[PDB]
Design an enzyme around this catalytic site. Structure first.
Site, PDB file in Angstrom:
ATOM      1  N   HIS A 115       2.249  18.821  48.147  1.00  0.00           N
ATOM      2  CA  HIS A 115       3.523  19.107  47.505  1.00  0.00           C
ATOM      3  C   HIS A 115       4.658  18.326  48.158  1.00  0.00           C
TER       4      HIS A 115
ATOM      5  N   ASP B 167      20.318  -8.384  33.968  1.00  0.00           N
ATOM      6  CA  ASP B 167      19.050  -7.939  34.513  1.00  0.00           C
ATOM      7  C   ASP B 167      19.147  -8.028  36.034  1.00  0.00           C
TER       8      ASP B 167
ATOM      9  N   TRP C 296       3.741  16.911  55.563  1.00  0.00           N
ATOM     10  CA  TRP C 296       4.147  15.649  54.962  1.00  0.00           C
ATOM     11  C   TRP C 296       4.630  14.627  55.986  1.00  0.00           C
TER      12      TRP C 296
ATOM     13  N   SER D 206       7.146  -0.344  47.535  1.00  0.00           N
ATOM     14  CA  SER D 206       7.864  -0.209  46.270  1.00  0.00           C
ATOM     15  C   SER D 206       9.355  -0.001  46.503  1.00  0.00           C
ATOM     16  N   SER D 207       9.711   0.855  47.459  1.00  0.00           N
ATOM     17  CA  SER D 207      11.122   1.083  47.747  1.00  0.00           C
ATOM     18  C   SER D 207      11.784  -0.160  48.327  1.00  0.00           C
TER      19      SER D 207
ATOM     20  N   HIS E 220      15.247  11.155  58.766  1.00  0.00           N
ATOM     21  CA  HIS E 220      16.537  11.616  58.263  1.00  0.00           C
ATOM     22  C   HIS E 220      17.150  10.623  57.278  1.00  0.00           C
TER      23      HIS E 220
ATOM     24  N   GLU F  21      15.746   8.803  55.097  1.00  0.00           N
ATOM     25  CA  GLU F  21      15.059   9.127  53.848  1.00  0.00           C
ATOM     26  C   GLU F  21      15.778  10.230  53.090  1.00  0.00           C
TER      27      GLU F  21
ATOM     28  N   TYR G 157      19.030  10.982  53.200  1.00  0.00           N
ATOM     29  CA  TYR G 157      20.244  10.470  52.587  1.00  0.00           C
ATOM     30  C   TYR G 157      19.961   9.393  51.549  1.00  0.00           C
TER      31      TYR G 157
ATOM     32  N   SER H 161      29.789  11.872  40.496  1.00  0.00           N
ATOM     33  CA  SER H 161      31.111  11.271  40.334  1.00  0.00           C
ATOM     34  C   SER H 161      31.351  10.840  38.891  1.00  0.00           C
TER      35      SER H 161
ATOM     36  N   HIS I 224      17.667  15.728  65.704  1.00  0.00           N
ATOM     37  CA  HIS I 224      17.855  17.138  65.391  1.00  0.00           C
ATOM     38  C   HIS I 224      16.615  17.747  64.739  1.00  0.00           C
ATOM     39  N   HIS I 225      15.595  16.936  64.467  1.00  0.00           N
ATOM     40  CA  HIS I 225      14.283  17.412  64.060  1.00  0.00           C
ATOM     41  C   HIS I 225      13.359  17.668  65.243  1.00  0.00           C
TER      42      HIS I 225
ATOM     43  N   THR J  87      31.015  13.981  54.100  1.00  0.00           N
ATOM     44  CA  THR J  87      30.461  14.761  52.999  1.00  0.00           C
ATOM     45  C   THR J  87      31.502  15.713  52.424  1.00  0.00           C
TER      46      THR J  87
ATOM     47  N   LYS K  56      33.909  14.048  50.049  1.00  0.00           N
ATOM     48  CA  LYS K  56      33.411  13.885  48.687  1.00  0.00           C
ATOM     49  C   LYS K  56      33.459  15.202  47.917  1.00  0.00           C
TER      50      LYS K  56
ATOM     51  N   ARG L 293       6.972  28.352  59.145  1.00  0.00           N
ATOM     52  CA  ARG L 293       6.563  27.425  58.101  1.00  0.00           C
ATOM     53  C   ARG L 293       5.051  27.203  58.130  1.00  0.00           C
TER      54      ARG L 293
HETATM   55  C1  HEA Z   1      18.640  16.147  50.308  1.00  0.00           C
HETATM   56  C2  HEA Z   1      18.008  16.113  51.431  1.00  0.00           C
HETATM   57  C3  HEA Z   1      18.715  16.612  52.593  1.00  0.00           C
HETATM   58  C4  HEA Z   1      20.119  16.545  52.848  1.00  0.00           C
HETATM   59  C5  HEA Z   1      21.220  15.954  52.047  1.00  0.00           C
HETATM   60  C6  HEA Z   1      20.203  17.203  54.137  1.00  0.00           C
HETATM   61  C7  HEA Z   1      21.497  17.353  54.790  1.00  0.00           C
HETATM   62  C8  HEA Z   1      21.768  17.881  56.109  1.00  0.00           C
HETATM   63  N1  HEA Z   1      20.804  18.421  56.857  1.00  0.00           N
HETATM   64 FE1  HEA Z   1      18.769  18.612  56.424  1.00  0.00          FE
HETATM   65  N2  HEA Z   1      16.734  18.670  56.012  1.00  0.00           N
HETATM   66  C9  HEA Z   1      16.084  18.212  54.951  1.00  0.00           C
HETATM   67  C10 HEA Z   1      16.748  17.565  53.833  1.00  0.00           C
HETATM   68  C11 HEA Z   1      18.158  17.294  53.726  1.00  0.00           C
HETATM   69  N3  HEA Z   1      19.050  17.636  54.638  1.00  0.00           N
HETATM   70  C12 HEA Z   1      14.640  18.367  54.946  1.00  0.00           C
HETATM   71  C13 HEA Z   1      13.649  17.959  53.922  1.00  0.00           C
HETATM   72  C14 HEA Z   1      14.400  19.013  56.193  1.00  0.00           C
HETATM   73  C15 HEA Z   1      13.104  19.469  56.761  1.00  0.00           C
HETATM   74  C16 HEA Z   1      12.241  18.331  57.187  1.00  0.00           C
HETATM   75  C17 HEA Z   1      10.917  18.876  57.558  1.00  0.00           C
HETATM   76  O1  HEA Z   1      10.721  19.328  58.657  1.00  0.00           O
HETATM   77  O2  HEA Z   1      10.044  18.857  56.744  1.00  0.00           O
HETATM   78  C18 HEA Z   1      15.737  19.129  56.740  1.00  0.00           C
HETATM   79  C19 HEA Z   1      15.957  19.757  58.015  1.00  0.00           C
HETATM   80  C20 HEA Z   1      17.191  19.657  58.744  1.00  0.00           C
HETATM   81  C21 HEA Z   1      17.230  19.851  60.185  1.00  0.00           C
HETATM   82  C22 HEA Z   1      16.085  20.074  61.126  1.00  0.00           C
HETATM   83  C23 HEA Z   1      15.951  21.573  61.296  1.00  0.00           C
HETATM   84  C24 HEA Z   1      14.657  22.032  61.898  1.00  0.00           C
HETATM   85  O3  HEA Z   1      13.632  21.552  61.505  1.00  0.00           O
HETATM   86  O4  HEA Z   1      14.647  22.890  62.746  1.00  0.00           O
HETATM   87  C25 HEA Z   1      18.643  19.738  60.486  1.00  0.00           C
HETATM   88  C26 HEA Z   1      19.140  19.840  61.869  1.00  0.00           C
HETATM   89  O5  HEA Z   1      20.231  19.547  62.238  1.00  0.00           O
HETATM   90  C27 HEA Z   1      19.358  19.492  59.233  1.00  0.00           C
HETATM   91  C28 HEA Z   1      20.791  19.396  59.083  1.00  0.00           C
HETATM   92  C29 HEA Z   1      21.456  18.764  57.953  1.00  0.00           C
HETATM   93  C30 HEA Z   1      22.889  18.491  57.961  1.00  0.00           C
HETATM   94  C31 HEA Z   1      23.899  18.760  59.013  1.00  0.00           C
HETATM   95  C32 HEA Z   1      23.120  17.881  56.681  1.00  0.00           C
HETATM   96  C33 HEA Z   1      24.428  17.406  56.208  1.00  0.00           C
HETATM   97  O6  HEA Z   1      24.258  16.138  55.631  1.00  0.00           O
HETATM   98  C34 HEA Z   1      25.055  18.377  55.243  1.00  0.00           C
HETATM   99  C35 HEA Z   1      26.567  18.260  55.195  1.00  0.00           C
HETATM  100  C36 HEA Z   1      27.117  18.997  54.015  1.00  0.00           C
HETATM  101  C37 HEA Z   1      27.927  20.031  54.180  1.00  0.00           C
HETATM  102  C38 HEA Z   1      28.305  20.490  55.526  1.00  0.00           C
HETATM  103  C39 HEA Z   1      28.474  20.777  53.007  1.00  0.00           C
HETATM  104  C40 HEA Z   1      29.731  20.120  52.447  1.00  0.00           C
HETATM  105  C41 HEA Z   1      30.835  20.016  53.461  1.00  0.00           C
HETATM  106  C42 HEA Z   1      32.004  20.627  53.334  1.00  0.00           C
HETATM  107  C43 HEA Z   1      32.285  21.447  52.135  1.00  0.00           C
HETATM  108  C44 HEA Z   1      33.044  20.456  54.396  1.00  0.00           C
HETATM  109  C45 HEA Z   1      33.231  21.691  55.251  1.00  0.00           C
HETATM  110  C46 HEA Z   1      32.016  21.937  56.086  1.00  0.00           C
HETATM  111  C47 HEA Z   1      32.062  22.191  57.385  1.00  0.00           C
HETATM  112  C48 HEA Z   1      33.336  22.247  58.122  1.00  0.00           C
HETATM  113  C49 HEA Z   1      30.806  22.423  58.132  1.00  0.00           C
HETATM  114  N4  HEA Z   1      18.376  19.333  58.306  1.00  0.00           N
HETATM  115  C1  HEA Z   2      12.579  17.176  46.422  1.00  0.00           C
HETATM  116  C2  HEA Z   2      11.797  17.804  47.219  1.00  0.00           C
HETATM  117  C3  HEA Z   2      11.302  19.128  46.862  1.00  0.00           C
HETATM  118  C4  HEA Z   2      11.405  19.864  45.640  1.00  0.00           C
HETATM  119  C5  HEA Z   2      12.053  19.486  44.362  1.00  0.00           C
HETATM  120  C6  HEA Z   2      10.706  21.081  46.009  1.00  0.00           C
HETATM  121  C7  HEA Z   2      10.499  22.159  45.064  1.00  0.00           C
HETATM  122  C8  HEA Z   2       9.853  23.433  45.311  1.00  0.00           C
HETATM  123  N1  HEA Z   2       9.335  23.775  46.471  1.00  0.00           N
HETATM  124 FE1  HEA Z   2       9.210  22.638  48.180  1.00  0.00          FE
HETATM  125  N2  HEA Z   2       8.977  21.422  49.844  1.00  0.00           N
HETATM  126  C9  HEA Z   2       9.426  20.206  50.053  1.00  0.00           C
HETATM  127  C10 HEA Z   2      10.273  19.532  49.094  1.00  0.00           C
HETATM  128  C11 HEA Z   2      10.583  19.975  47.754  1.00  0.00           C
HETATM  129  N3  HEA Z   2      10.234  21.133  47.244  1.00  0.00           N
HETATM  130  C12 HEA Z   2       9.076  19.578  51.322  1.00  0.00           C
HETATM  131  C13 HEA Z   2       9.435  18.238  51.867  1.00  0.00           C
HETATM  132  C14 HEA Z   2       8.284  20.577  51.971  1.00  0.00           C
HETATM  133  C15 HEA Z   2       7.650  20.523  53.317  1.00  0.00           C
HETATM  134  C16 HEA Z   2       6.152  20.427  53.285  1.00  0.00           C
HETATM  135  C17 HEA Z   2       5.619  20.544  54.673  1.00  0.00           C
HETATM  136  O1  HEA Z   2       5.824  21.509  55.363  1.00  0.00           O
HETATM  137  O2  HEA Z   2       4.982  19.643  55.122  1.00  0.00           O
HETATM  138  C18 HEA Z   2       8.316  21.624  50.972  1.00  0.00           C
HETATM  139  C19 HEA Z   2       7.622  22.844  51.224  1.00  0.00           C
HETATM  140  C20 HEA Z   2       7.789  24.011  50.408  1.00  0.00           C
HETATM  141  C21 HEA Z   2       7.540  25.351  50.920  1.00  0.00           C
HETATM  142  C22 HEA Z   2       7.205  25.819  52.292  1.00  0.00           C
HETATM  143  C23 HEA Z   2       5.708  25.804  52.402  1.00  0.00           C
HETATM  144  C24 HEA Z   2       5.158  26.196  53.726  1.00  0.00           C
HETATM  145  O3  HEA Z   2       5.789  26.106  54.734  1.00  0.00           O
HETATM  146  O4  HEA Z   2       4.041  26.617  53.780  1.00  0.00           O
HETATM  147  C25 HEA Z   2       7.720  26.172  49.764  1.00  0.00           C
HETATM  148  C26 HEA Z   2       7.618  27.631  49.841  1.00  0.00           C
HETATM  149  O5  HEA Z   2       7.520  28.281  48.868  1.00  0.00           O
HETATM  150  C27 HEA Z   2       8.066  25.322  48.632  1.00  0.00           C
HETATM  151  C28 HEA Z   2       8.274  25.767  47.274  1.00  0.00           C
HETATM  152  C29 HEA Z   2       8.921  24.993  46.245  1.00  0.00           C
HETATM  153  C30 HEA Z   2       9.157  25.525  44.929  1.00  0.00           C
HETATM  154  C31 HEA Z   2       8.793  26.863  44.399  1.00  0.00           C
HETATM  155  C32 HEA Z   2       9.822  24.436  44.276  1.00  0.00           C
HETATM  156  C33 HEA Z   2      10.277  24.310  42.890  1.00  0.00           C
HETATM  157  O6  HEA Z   2       9.307  24.981  42.150  1.00  0.00           O
HETATM  158  C34 HEA Z   2      11.635  24.862  42.570  1.00  0.00           C
HETATM  159  C35 HEA Z   2      11.907  24.721  41.102  1.00  0.00           C
HETATM  160  C36 HEA Z   2      12.343  23.340  40.782  1.00  0.00           C
HETATM  161  C37 HEA Z   2      12.050  22.853  39.599  1.00  0.00           C
HETATM  162  C38 HEA Z   2      11.323  23.708  38.643  1.00  0.00           C
HETATM  163  C39 HEA Z   2      12.468  21.495  39.165  1.00  0.00           C
HETATM  164  C40 HEA Z   2      11.926  20.359  39.970  1.00  0.00           C
HETATM  165  C41 HEA Z   2      12.450  19.088  39.385  1.00  0.00           C
HETATM  166  C42 HEA Z   2      12.031  17.917  39.837  1.00  0.00           C
HETATM  167  C43 HEA Z   2      11.040  17.887  40.931  1.00  0.00           C
HETATM  168  C44 HEA Z   2      12.558  16.649  39.273  1.00  0.00           C
HETATM  169  C45 HEA Z   2      11.494  15.819  38.607  1.00  0.00           C
HETATM  170  C46 HEA Z   2      11.975  15.704  37.207  1.00  0.00           C
HETATM  171  C47 HEA Z   2      12.389  14.619  36.590  1.00  0.00           C
HETATM  172  C48 HEA Z   2      12.422  13.286  37.204  1.00  0.00           C
HETATM  173  C49 HEA Z   2      12.835  14.776  35.197  1.00  0.00           C
HETATM  174  N4  HEA Z   2       8.235  24.058  49.105  1.00  0.00           N
HETATM  175 CU   LIG Z   3      17.661  15.122  59.499  1.00  0.00          CU
END
Ligand code: HEA
Ligand code: HEA
Ligand SMILES: [Cu+2]
Ligand SMILES: CCCCCCCCCCO[C@@H]1O[C@H](CO)[C@@H](O[C@H]2O[C@H](CO)[C@@H](O)[C@H](O)[C@H]2O)[C@H](O)[C@H]1O
Ligand SMILES: CCCCCCCCCCO[C@@H]1O[C@H](CO)[C@@H](O[C@H]2O[C@H](CO)[C@@H](O)[C@H](O)[C@H]2O)[C@H](O)[C@H]1O
Ligand SMILES: CCCCCCCCCCO[C@@H]1O[C@H](CO)[C@@H](O[C@H]2O[C@H](CO)[C@@H](O)[C@H](O)[C@H]2O)[C@H](O)[C@H]1O
Ligand SMILES: CCCCCCCCCCO[C@@H]1O[C@H](CO)[C@@H](O[C@H]2O[C@H](CO)[C@@H](O)[C@H](O)[C@H]2O)[C@H](O)[C@H]1O
Ligand SMILES: CCCCCCCCCCO[C@@H]1O[C@H](CO)[C@@H](O[C@H]2O[C@H](CO)[C@@H](O)[C@H](O)[C@H]2O)[C@H](O)[C@H]1O
Ligand SMILES: OC[C@H]1O[C@H](O[C@H]2[C@H](O)[C@@H](O)[C@@H](O)O[C@@H]2CO)[C@H](O)[C@@H](O)[C@@H]1O
Ligand SMILES: CCCCCCCCCCCCC
Ligand SMILES: CCCCCCCCCCCCC
Ligand SMILES: CCCCCCCCCCCCC
Ligand SMILES: CCCCCCCCCCCCC
Ligand SMILES: CCCCCCCCCCCCC
Ligand SMILES: CCCCCCCCCCCCC
Ligand SMILES: CCCCCCCCCCCCC
Ligand SMILES: CCCCCCCCCCCCC
Ligand SMILES: CCCCCCCCCCCCC
Ligand SMILES: CCCCCCCCCCCCC
Ligand SMILES: CCCCCCCCCCCCC
Ligand SMILES: CCCC[C@@H](O)[C@@H](O)CO
Ligand SMILES: CCCC[C@@H](O)[C@@H](O)CO
Ligand SMILES: CCCC[C@@H](O)[C@@H](O)CO
Ligand SMILES: [Ca+2]
Ligand SMILES: [Cu+2]
Ligand SMILES: [Cu+2]
Ligand SMILES: [Mg+2]
Lengths: 535, 256
Positions: A86, A116, A156, A184-185, A268, A270, A272, A283, A317-318, A343, A346, A465
């Site tokens: 998944h 193009d 993953w 591909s990317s 990380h 990836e 962004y 936007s 931070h991971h 962020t 925006k 997890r």
């Molecule tokens: C879309 C993908 C995506 C995005 C955009 C982000 C955005 C951010 N993530 Fe996240 N993150 C993941 C996907 C993402 N993350 C995934 C997949 C994992 C798990 C990976 C794994 O283990 O599998 C993860 C896990 C993860 C961890 C590791 C945690 C752990 O495993 O124990 C941390 C730690 O710092 C973190 C922090 C953040 C922060 C600070 C942002 C910031 O960019 C967010 C900033 C946005 C805001 C803060 C809101 C808007 C801001 C305002 C409205 C201003 C006012 C706000 C303040 C004054 C605070 N992320």
């Molecule tokens: C984009 C990333 C993404 C998305 C969309 C999701 C979607 C969902 N995920 Fe997640 N999930 C991950 C990224 C994502 N996940 C990652 C990285 C992990 C970590 C794996 C690991 O530990 O190694 C994870 C693990 C994870 C866990 C933790 C598992 C564990 O620790 O054992 C769970 C728990 O329930 C879960 C559930 C779901 C459910 C119910 C949905 C969805 O069912 C929610 C409903 C959303 C939809 C119904 C729409 C989805 C739409 C799209 C995907 C767009 C595609 C469509 C077009 C292009 C038209 N996910």
């Molecule tokens: Cu990160």
């Protein structure tokens, strides 16, 4: 005919990315339905080892009906394979191919006035590497893997020594899949950067390029630095597994933590790479349906550049619990907090664009408004996780899982749906029925919130997890979370019905710009669909 | 002994605190929680008001402003101030967490597939801890009448299944416990939520954590790094007892 797949036009390639990303998305979402079936109640009822002793197709259908605990021998490997499949499919073969390879390939040239991309033949090859990588990832699920079963149950991110000691060759197929995905990317990134710099229309300077094309531009740079690093990390896994190296094996002087530094240096960025194209779509969508130009166009461009640059210096931070010193924990905590400032610029600009406008609440605007609210929820929990003192409790719990589904499944995915309803008329010449797109939004909004908000509770209660089963005390909020996932799945099947209806018998689009005058970018001055030769 | 460190039905908050470090985590989390809830409520109220006040059917002529530097600078300095306030209260808490004091009791913990090995170097005591219900105890990681009876015989109930182990790590109350964590095959993670501690068990490395339990009782943890087929089936049981009962436990292990 097969002329769909051999085309090199950027519009047909973007459509192939969109459709393929959607079908792979359907497969991965179906995995989560099965996952949430097993997590709905404590004790194991579906993933029984007894199902292995039957046929490959016979045991599949038996896996979907619950057994009593006394007749179900827990099979943790299948759980680990499902969540690994998944996660791999989503992070490498769904959202980025749809946002970058799909909407990026289709609309970035239109937004800059290019006919193009610089290398159309390379752009067609990038799609086939994506499809090749997707095939290897799916094939790994059916290849001999860990514990004498099929598939790789390694997460993953493929942490060693677990990934390097998993038996079989399913893990090698998974690594080759990620290699093809990164290629591909990279090919796509080369084409975005070369076309953005060399093929802009006369009079289109960089301070005149729309925000979506800027988001694709910044994303393409992040890809060029992050995805070669990942290729090295996963190649060192392949040599430790097959070629006698000991990069991550302590017996030969290796260090498993070294891998985490290399992988998260990509890991990380990836993240962004996923959300930046969604920022650009928001936007364009908000400016259109608020009937007002975007607030602070130049800070919006810089903030995306600031976010993309900072995303390369926060990776540890991971690894707060992986054995990092107090000094590195302190730096990465403070560096991560800085990302909240660009962020937030925006987010507040998007509200500023709405302020003083004439807001129409059509379906694309609904997704964008949900994005603002739901991405903020996920973003502030990321700030919580950035505090290493608090991440000590939350790390490897479902609080992290709640965080990244709010920014991905309730944020980036909301940007994908926003772009589809915003552009399906332009891409296909047919319009979606407004009432159905609204019902899809509200079903998805309610279901996805019921799925993931209770996981904050489970994380605060300490649910780890990657668990097939959990103590009885976690039952209540796991039940609610599974119900939300089933409702969410219903909303996605309904969405597929809406897309099928739209493309076959949807209302015929006649106007070049079927929205309003504030959709002011070049694609709205062309036909719906645009001609087979642009500019 | 009272079962304290464990999840509770329908729980939405942290597990009960039993250490000063866990107490600091609860307070820092609640402090960060009220401000991020304020930020999200602020953002949500702005969006709902703007949609209501500037809907098409109430404001038919949209404005055209694109700039407002005093606002744009206000919504940039205020988040920076907010984040600096968080780091001001957060960095001392993290320094208290990672700075290892002098040990009254020292335990060396090793993660295996799939169980934990405990060793007290000052006492020459060593044992392994398996989940009640694991193959080591005769089960296959599922509830059964035999497993429930084993849970009762060990001093637990059916509710503690997946948390209770056959043996426990016993420590004296109100004493500084330093734990040295490592992995033997793959990476595991040793944690006790009630203590506010968590450290990955990496092969080839020996990392350290510390806790001081402020009350007696039973406290559970679960392996927190995916380690293979039985990742969900190798928990942690820590019993905090009196200094006298601790010595009694030590003496029961001494070989004459
Ligand atoms: C879309 C993908 C995506 C995005 C955009 C982000 C955005 C951010 N993530 Fe996240 N993150 C993941 C996907 C993402 N993350 C995934 C997949 C994992 C798990 C990976 C794994 O283990 O599998 C993860 C896990 C993860 C961890 C590791 C945690 C752990 O495993 O124990 C941390 C730690 O710092 C973190 C922090 C953040 C922060 C600070 C942002 C910031 O960019 C967010 C900033 C946005 C805001 C803060 C809101 C808007 C801001 C305002 C409205 C201003 C006012 C706000 C303040 C004054 C605070 N992320
Ligand atoms: C984009 C990333 C993404 C998305 C969309 C999701 C979607 C969902 N995920 Fe997640 N999930 C991950 C990224 C994502 N996940 C990652 C990285 C992990 C970590 C794996 C690991 O530990 O190694 C994870 C693990 C994870 C866990 C933790 C598992 C564990 O620790 O054992 C769970 C728990 O329930 C879960 C559930 C779901 C459910 C119910 C949905 C969805 O069912 C929610 C409903 C959303 C939809 C119904 C729409 C989805 C739409 C799209 C995907 C767009 C595609 C469509 C077009 C292009 C038209 N996910
Ligand atoms: Cu990160
Ligand atoms: C849009 C389509 C989406 C598809 C969604 C599919 C939903 C399928 C629901 C599964 O059915 C339930 O499974 C539970 C198992 O988790 C059972 O719980 C009960 O049965 C088990 C025995 O199998 C016990 O161990 C449990 O404790 C007990 O709660 C319960 O009886 C059963 O009805
Ligand atoms: C989950 C997936 C999400 C879906 C994403 C949105 C769907 C994409 C739009 C569908 O593709 C379009 O279909 C049109 C059908 O009319 C084509 O018009 C074409 O119609 C003729 C062929 O039918 C061609 O000769 C013309 O050049 C051309 O206008 C057009 O090329 C093609 O791009
Ligand atoms: C796998 C899970 C799938 C779950 C599927 C959920 C099914 C819900 C469909 C409800 O039925 C539809 O409701 C609409 C009520 O609005 C009607 O549109 C009606 O109302 C619209 C707007 O009010 C008009 O534009 C339409 O012309 C008019 O048909 C429409 O006819 C009717 O069929
Ligand atoms: C699990 C799979 C779920 C599949 C879900 C399918 C989603 C797509 C359903 C679209 O429904 C259509 O909406 C139209 C509204 O846009 C209706 O046109 C109605 O409304 C138009 C506008 O008023 C009229 O001109 C039409 O004649 C009138 O039929 C039409 O009847 C109705 O069928
Ligand atoms: C090509 C490869 C495989 C692609 C897979 C996609 C399969 C999705 C088929 C869904 O098609 C829709 O099915 C609905 C019935 O099942 C119809 O809605 C009907 O039923 C709805 C609910 O009652 C009403 O709202 C609608 O008005 C009414 O048209 C709708 O017309 C039709 O387009
Ligand atoms: O918990 C308080 C904490 O204070 C000191 O830590 C300081 C550190 O000395 C400074 O360099 C600063 O930048 O970071 C910390 C802020 O509190 C003590 O050194 C430390 O032992 C103590 O725990
Ligand atoms: C029908 C193709 C999509 C698969 C849906 C997920 C179901 C997973 C069942 C796994 C059964 C174990 C072999
Ligand atoms: C009381 C006997 C069991 C009744 C519940 C069976 C539920 C089966 C749901 C199957 C869902 C497939 C997606
Ligand atoms: C020949 C074994 C694989 C080599 C891959 C690159 C190893 C060098 C370390 C670089 C790590 C990526 C930056
Ligand atoms: C291409 C970037 C790879 C990450 C650099 C490796 C960092 C190693 C840190 C070792 C710290 C030891 C104290
Ligand atoms: C966070 C998204 C909230 C969006 C509010 C939409 C309100 C819609 C009111 C009905 C409009 C006519 C259908
Ligand atoms: C013209 C009527 C507006 C169409 C609104 C469709 C959505 C209705 C709300 C559905 C809520 C489902 C949870
Ligand atoms: C104790 C038995 C609980 C069975 C609950 C089954 C819930 C299935 C609901 C599916 C709803 C989909 C929207
Ligand atoms: C204990 C809470 C019951 C379930 C609440 C549903 C929302
Ligand atoms: C912006 C909300 C962050 C999501 C976390 C929700 C935490 C809820 C706290 C409940 C504690 C009850 C004791
Ligand atoms: C453990 C709870 C801590 C409460 C901290 C209160 C901080 C007040 C912040 C000012 C008001 C902002 C909404
Ligand atoms: C190898 C023995 C490990 C500990 C087994 C359970 C703890 C025994 C009780 C300790 C004293 C409780 C008051
Ligand atoms: C496009 C808006 C530019 C405004 C910006 O340069 C300054 O007001 C922010 O300090
Ligand atoms: C915006 C930078 C935030 C950093 C801040 O929280 C701490 O470094 C201050 O002690
Ligand atoms: C309380 C009994 C302590 C006895 C002590 O010598 C042993 O722990 C050493 O093997
Ligand atoms: Ca279950
Ligand atoms: Cu383990
Ligand atoms: Cu584990
Ligand atoms: Mg971990």
């Amino acid at each position: 005919f097969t002329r769909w797949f051999m085309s090199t036009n950027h519009k047909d390639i973007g459509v192939l990315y969109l459709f393929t990303g959607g079908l792979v998305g359907l497969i991965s979402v179906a995995f989560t339905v099965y996952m949430r079936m097993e997590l709905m109640a404590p004790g194991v009822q579906f993933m029984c080892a007894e199902h292995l002793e039957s046929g490959l197709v016979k045991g599949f259908f038996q896996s979907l009906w619950p057994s009593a605990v006394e007749n179900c021998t827990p099979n943790g490997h299948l759980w680990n394979v499902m969540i690994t499949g998944h996660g791999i499919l989503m992070m490498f073969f769904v959202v980025i191919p749809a946002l970058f390879g799909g909407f990026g390939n289709y609309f970035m040239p239109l937004h800059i006035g290019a006919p193009d991309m610089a290398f159309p033949r390379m752009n067609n090859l990038s799609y086939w590497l994506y499809v090749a990588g997707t095939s290897l990832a799916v094939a790994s699920l059916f290849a001999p893997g860990g514990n004498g079963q099929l598939g790789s149950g390694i997460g993953w991110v493929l942490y060693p020594p677990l990934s390097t000691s998993e038996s079989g060759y399913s893990t090698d197929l998974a690594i080759f899949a990620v290699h093809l995905s990164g290629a591909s990317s990279i090919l796509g990134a080369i084409n975005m950067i070369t076309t953005f710099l060399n093929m802009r229309a006369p009079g289109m300077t960089m301070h005149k390029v729309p925000l979506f094309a800027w988001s694709i531009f910044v994303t393409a740079w992040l890809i060029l630095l992050a995805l070669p690093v990942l290729a090295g990390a996963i190649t060192m896994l392949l040599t430790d597994r097959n070629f006698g190296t000991t990069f991550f094996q302590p017996s030969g002087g290796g260090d498993p933590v070294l891998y985490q530094h290399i992988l998260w240096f990509f890991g990380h960025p990836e993240v962004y790479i996923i959300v930046l194209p969604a920022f650009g779509i928001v936007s364009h969508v908000i400016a259109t349906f608020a009937k007002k130009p975007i607030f602070g166009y130049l800070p919006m461009v810089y903030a995306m550049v600031a976010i993309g640059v900072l995303g390369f210096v926060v990776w540890a931070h991971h690894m707060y619990t992986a054995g990092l010193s107090l000094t590195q924990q302190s730096y990465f905590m403070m560096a991560t907090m800085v990302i909240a400032v660009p962020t937030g610029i925006k987010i507040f600009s998007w509200i500023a664009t709405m302020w003083g406008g004439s807001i129409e609440l059509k379906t694309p605007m609904l997704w964008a408004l949900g994005f603002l609210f739901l991405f903020t929820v996920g973003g502030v929990t990321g700030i919580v996780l950035s505090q290493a003192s608090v991440d000590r409790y939350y790390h490897d719990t479902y609080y992290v899982v709640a965080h990244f589904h709010y920014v991905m499944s309730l944020g980036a995915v909301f940007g994908i749906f926003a772009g589809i309803y915003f552009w399906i008329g332009k891409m296909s010449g047919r319009q979606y029925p407004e009432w159905a797109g609204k019902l899809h939004f509200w079903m998805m909004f309610v279901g996805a919130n019921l799925t993931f908000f209770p996981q904050h509770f489970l994380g605060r209660q300490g649910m780890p997890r990657r668990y097939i089963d959990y103590p009885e005390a976690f039952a209540t909020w796991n039940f609610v979370s599974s119900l939300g996932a089933f409702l969410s799945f219903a909303s996605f099947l309904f969405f597929l019905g809406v897309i099928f209806y739209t493309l076959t018998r949807g209302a015929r689009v006649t106007a070049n710009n079927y929205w309003n005058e504030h959709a002011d970018t070049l694609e709205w001055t062309l036909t719906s669909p645009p001609p087979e030769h642009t500019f | 002994l009272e079962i304290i460190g464990r999840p509770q039905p329908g729980g939405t908050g942290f597990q009960p605190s039993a250490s000063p470090v866990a107490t600091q985590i609860h307070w820092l989390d609640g402090f960060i929680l009220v401000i991020i809830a304020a930020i999200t409520i602020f953002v949500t109220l702005l969006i709902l008001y703007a949609v209501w006040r500037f809907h098409e059917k109430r404001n038919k002529v949209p404005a055209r402003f694109t700039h407002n530097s005093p606002l744009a600078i206000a919504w940039t300095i205020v988040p920076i101030v907010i984040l600096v306030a968080i780091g001001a209260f957060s960095l001392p808490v993290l320094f208290n967490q990672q700075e290892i004091p002098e040990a009254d009791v020292t335990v060396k913990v090793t993660g295996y597939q799939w169980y934990w090995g405990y060793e007290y170097p000052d006492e020459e005591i060593s044992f392994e801890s398996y989940m009640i219900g694991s193959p080591a105890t005769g089960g296959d990681n599922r509830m059964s009448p035999e497993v429930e009876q084993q849970l009762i015989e060990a001093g637990y109930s059916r509710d503690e299944f997946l948390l209770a182990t056959d043996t426990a790590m016993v420590v004296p109350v109100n004493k500084t416990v330093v734990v040295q964590v490592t992995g033997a095959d793959v990476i595991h993670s040793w944690t006790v939520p009630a203590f506010g501690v968590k450290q990955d068990a990496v092969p080839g490395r020996l990392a350290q954590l510390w806790f001081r339990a402020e009350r007696e009782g039973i406290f559970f943890g679960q392996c927190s790094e995916l380690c293979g087929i039985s990742h969900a089936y190798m928990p942690i049981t820590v019993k905090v007892v009196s200094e006298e009962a601790y010595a009694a436990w030590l003496e029961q292990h001494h070989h004459h």
